[PDB]
């Protein structure tokens, strides 16, 4: 299940 507050930026 996905964390909505995971990092949404490019790596």
């Amino acid at each position: 299940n996905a964390n909505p507050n995971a990092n949404p930026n490019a790596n």
Epitope: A2, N5, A6, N7, P8, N9, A10
Partner: antibody, heavy 124, light 107 residues
Framework: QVQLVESGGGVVQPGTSLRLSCAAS????????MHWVRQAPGKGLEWVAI????????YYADSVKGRFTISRDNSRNTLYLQMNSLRAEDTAVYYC?????????????????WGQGTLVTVSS | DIQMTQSPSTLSASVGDRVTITCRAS??????LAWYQQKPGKAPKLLIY???NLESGVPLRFSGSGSGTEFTLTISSLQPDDFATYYC????????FGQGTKVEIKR
């Protein structure tokens, strides 16, 4: 310096749909997640939606779920909010907001830059 | 949701005063708390993120403290530009704002 310019707001009738835009510049737009946040006249700030840098994940506030869609066109540095089945209580200034960098490892979602906002007035 | 409650909702202060605004989360949010300033008709501007980290360019009179469920924003010596509304925001699980605290001029 970061610039975020919203457009598309105006007076619309209830039950119609409307698309908002946010033109981004002064940073690498395609590397950042983005959010929309809104503020009804005289009220507080309300988070609306988030989209990943690559569009691969989107989340929405329960108040707009099933009615609003966030999207983006990275080749044009533009963020969109598609608002369907508009209601009187969607009247608000809509802000686009860039995700702040954070320190390494941090949970995400504070906003280091905000647009000036675009006013949507839902009225007959 | 994680409900954010600021205290007080309105604060009357004078220039030069030490001013503290409190923000409590109904669930533990670790350090993931930001503060914003808003003036009438203008977009909000970021002051503090990760509870205590001053955003680059923000004046040094602004600071923040806390973790878990209780947080504060302090203006060490209030200036005329500081009369405004302040919001906290958690970004631990989804994203929610406090109701705002207006800092008004005492007379």
């Amino acid at each position: 310096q970061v610039q975020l310019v919203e457009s598309g707001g105006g007076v619309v009738q209830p039950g119609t749909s409307l698309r908002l835009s946010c033109a981004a510049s002064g940073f690498t737009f395609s590397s950042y997640g983005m959010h929309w946040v809104r503020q009804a006249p005289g009220k507080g700030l309300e988070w609306v939606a988030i989209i990943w840098y690559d569009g691969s994940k989107k989340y929405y506030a329960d108040s707009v779920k099933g009615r609003f869609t966030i999207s983006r066109d990275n080749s044009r540095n533009t963020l969109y909010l598609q608002m369907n089945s508009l209601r009187a209580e969607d009247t608000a200034v809509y802000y686009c907001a860039k995700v702040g960098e954070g320190q390494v490892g941090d949970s995400s979602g504070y906003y280091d830059h905000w647009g000036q906002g675009t006013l949507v007035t839902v009225s007959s | 949701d994680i409900q954010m409650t600021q205290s007080p909702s309105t604060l009357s202060a004078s220039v030069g005063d030490r001013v503290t605004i409190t923000c409590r989360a109904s669930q533990s949010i670790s350090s993931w708390l930001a503060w914003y300033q808003q003036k009438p008709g203008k977009a909000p501007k970021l002051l503090i993120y990760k509870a205590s980290n001053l955003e680059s360019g923000v004046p040094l009179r602004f600071s923040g403290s806390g973790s878990g469920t209780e947080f504060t924003l302090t203006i060490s010596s209030l200036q005329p530009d500081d009369f405004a509304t302040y919001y906290c925001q958690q970004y631990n699980n989804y994203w929610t704002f406090g109701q705002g605290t207006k800092v008004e001029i005492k007379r």
